[PDB]
């Protein structure tokens with residue numbers, strides 16, 4: 001409360017599925033990139049975005065998981081994803097082996113722009 005993980009403009013264009021790549025407006029490989037946020041903490045993730053709807057992805061390649069979730073809610077161009085959601089989609093709240101974290105847009109006419117991403121710690 002509060003750990004800034006990104007700021008400034010990032011536009012992503014995405015028309016539909018079934019192509020080559022599904023691009024991200026923001027993404028981390030936590031096995032190689034150092035990361036501020038503590039996953040074992042009880043947390044939420046807030047994203048300031050504009051335009052198309054969005055999803056948050058937590059993925060592990062070797063066990064082949066693709067936890068992908070919608071916002072808990074959205075207010076004033078700010079979405080909110082909780083840990084309860086992520087863990088439920090992931091199958092567990094133990095993220096050892098985690099390969100990939102990303103904010104991705106759904107198929108839209110004219111894409112999305114992310115202005116900021118952050119994390120917050122909570123009192124369970």
Ligand SMILES: OC[C@H]1O[C@@H](O)[C@H](O)[C@@H](O)[C@@H]1O[C@@H]1O[C@H](CO[C@H]2OC[C@@H](O)[C@H](O)[C@H]2O)[C@@H](O[C@@H]2O[C@H](CO[C@H]3OC[C@@H](O)[C@H](O)[C@H]3O)[C@@H](O[C@@H]3O[C@H](CO[C@H]4OC[C@@H](O)[C@H](O)[C@H]4O)[C@@H](O)[C@H](O)[C@H]3O)[C@H](O)[C@H]2O)[C@H](O)[C@H]1O
Nearest residue numbers: 017018019020021022023024061062064065066068100102
């Ligand atoms: O293990 C290989 C691994 O190596 C890494 O080095 C590499 O970077 C990884 O990309 C790669 O893993 C594969 O990633 C691709 C693409 O992932 C993106 O993010 C990672 C970036 O590196 C990369 O640049 C990006 O392109 C994944 O493909 C996507 O998979 C998701 C979800 O997983 C699907 O397949 C596995 C199965 O268990 C899931 O249930 C299934 O959903 C798909 O997202 C879903 O899309 C559907 C629409 O489906 C469409 O499929 C094909 C299309 O022709 C047809 O029209 C549609 O049916 C929506 O309904 C869902 O909302 C959504 O969840 C993407 O469509 C798909 O591109 C690979 O899964 C992964 O192996």
